[PDB]
A = this chain, B = another copy of it.
Amino acid sequence: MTFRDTSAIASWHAHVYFDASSRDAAWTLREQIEAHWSGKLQLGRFHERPVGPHPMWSYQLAFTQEQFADLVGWLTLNHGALDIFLHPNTGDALRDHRDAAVWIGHSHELVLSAL
């Protein structure tokens, strides 16, 4: 393979994964993300069903390479028992999710057929 630089990355997404057992925790973290960054981070719907490539219930957060250290550091400290799926967006969704998956906690098998 050939080495790429970080300019390849357009944006990052993080997806907070949860289920019925962890719904309250996921909602609390959502409220805290809103508060901590004062609603300046793009935030998707609180999906209580599997959507797209996501095998768990999820919600999406979007941010840049320039916010990556702050957001990922903070999520690493504060995610609790919730797994978080992170991936860069480079313009090739399948490649990004298949090959550039990062996980805070534990990894999950994605529904790649959705991409």
Contact = CB atoms under 8 A, between A and B. Distances in A.
Nearest to A101: B105
A30 to B, nearest CB: 13
Number of copies: 2
A9 B77 contact: yes
Given A101-B105, A103-B102, A32 B9 contact: no
Nearest to A81: B99
Interface residues of A, number: 32
A74 B5 CA distance: 6
B105 A76 contact: no
Contact of A1 (B68, B73, B80): B80
Contacts of A9: 73, 77
Which 9 A-B residue pairings sit nearest by Cβ, starting from the closest? A6-B73, A69-B69, A4-B77, A107-B107, A68-B69, A106-B107, A103-B103, A1-B80, A3-B78
